[PDB]
Nucleic acid binder design. Structure first.
Length: 51
DNA sequence: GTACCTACGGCTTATGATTCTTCTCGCTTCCGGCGGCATCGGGATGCCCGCGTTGCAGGCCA
């Protein structure tokens, strides 16, 4: 929960949005240019192992 | 693709210590009430006489 996740002010689901981008390259400007009402961004690190 | 360490210098803020404010234990002993009796100075009551109080009308003041 800490570290990377930055939720919005609203807590009721089906109203907010979630995004998945590169952390240090994209998430910075994404948070600096997003809204603080119904916006949430979850950064990522590199790739993800296959299933 | 990403994280964690200290030196170079200054103000502050996050917590254990010391002088100033205060809360009130101890009773006991010199001292302060407390009551009774002889004493003394004041005054209320009475009479006399002149002065303090008040009403009228005028000139001065806030």
């Amino acid at each position: 929960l800490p570290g990377k996740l930055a939720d919005c002010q609203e807590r009721d689901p089906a109203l907010s949005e979630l995004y998945l981008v590169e952390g240090d390259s994209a998430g910075g400007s994404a948070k600096q240019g997003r809204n603080r009402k119904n916006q949430a961004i979850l950064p990522l690190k590199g790739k993800i192992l296959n299933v």
